Design a protein around this ligand. Structure first.
Ligand SMILES: COc1ccc2nc(C)c(O[C@@H]3C[C@H]4C(=O)N[C@]5(C(=O)NS(=O)(=O)C6(C)CC6)C[C@H]5/C=C\CCCCC[C@H](NC(=O)OC5(C)CCCC5)C(=O)N4C3)nc2c1
Ligand SMILES: [Zn+2]
Length: 198
């Protein structure tokens, strides 16, 4: 009934992948209980830093990546949800189910990656565990892992970046291509598709 209908909570930043120095590592900035309360209110006063955020809903956790002032992630993680911010929930600025893509204005204090113009095919995938995985580009939206590994290691990394050798954003991790549970390739949203959406 209408009186009882509930609202889905906001996506909440719960940590980040630190790429500042010479060592990549995940940092948690909010625990599960604070995440649930922040999802309900949409009010997140935590300071935000860096390019790759770890984000959560009540039921899922994944990544979000700032490129050109937009925090991008996958529709299969975020749906149409708002994101929590210091001033309350922020409505999506971009939503494209056909590309599995959504975006919000980048939070204050985040840093944005620059879209790649190098045309290079030697890529690097950044996971939620701060692994930097070499990936050879195989198409507009596909790349092969130089060292395959179980899909378990990639689960929760959708929304993370594929980067070129120079650290530019080449795409947003979308899906894993698996054979008997082993990931041999990945699918991603190319940054040009982001730049067109923009
Ligand atoms: C609901 O509206 C929409 C709209 C568009 C859409 N487009 C999609 C492409 C789409 O795929 C679905 C989600 C996505 C996914 O799991 N991604 C992540 C991830 O980490 N997720 S996550 O962070 O854990 C989570 C779950 C957000 C919290 C990186 C992969 C890590 C490990 C893989 C585990 C096994 C799943 C293998 C699937 N392989 C696959 O489909 O390969 C095809 C067949 C398609 C392309 C190459 C060949 C797969 O990867 N899948 C299925 N769902 C949608 C849903
Ligand atoms: Zn580049």
């Amino acid at each position: 009934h209408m009186a009882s209908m509930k609202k889905k909570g906001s996506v909440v930043i719960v940590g980040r992948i630190n790429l500042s120095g010479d060592t990549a590592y995940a940092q948690q900035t909010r625990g599960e209980e604070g995440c649930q309360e922040t999802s309900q209110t949409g009010r997140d006063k935590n300071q935000v830093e860096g390019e790759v955020q770890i984000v959560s809903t009540a039921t899922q956790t994944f990544l979000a990546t700032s490129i050109n002032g937009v925090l991008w992630t996958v529709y299969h993680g975020a749906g149409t949800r708002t994101i929590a911010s210091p001033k309350g929930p922020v409505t999506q600025m971009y939503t494209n189910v056909d590309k599995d893509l959504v975006g919000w204005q980048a939070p204050q204090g985040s840093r944005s990656l620059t879209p790649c113009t190098c045309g290079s095919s030697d890529l690097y995938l950044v996971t939620r565990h701060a692994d930097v995985i070499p990936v050879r580009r195989r198409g507009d939206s596909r790349g092969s892992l130089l060292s395959p590994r179980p899909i378990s290691y990639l689960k929760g990394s959708s929304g993370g970046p594929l980067l070129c050798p120079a650290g530019h954003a080449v795409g947003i991790f979308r899906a894993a291509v698996s054979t008997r549970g082993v990931a041999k390739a990945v699918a991603f949203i190319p940054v040009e598709s982001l730049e067109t959406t923009m």
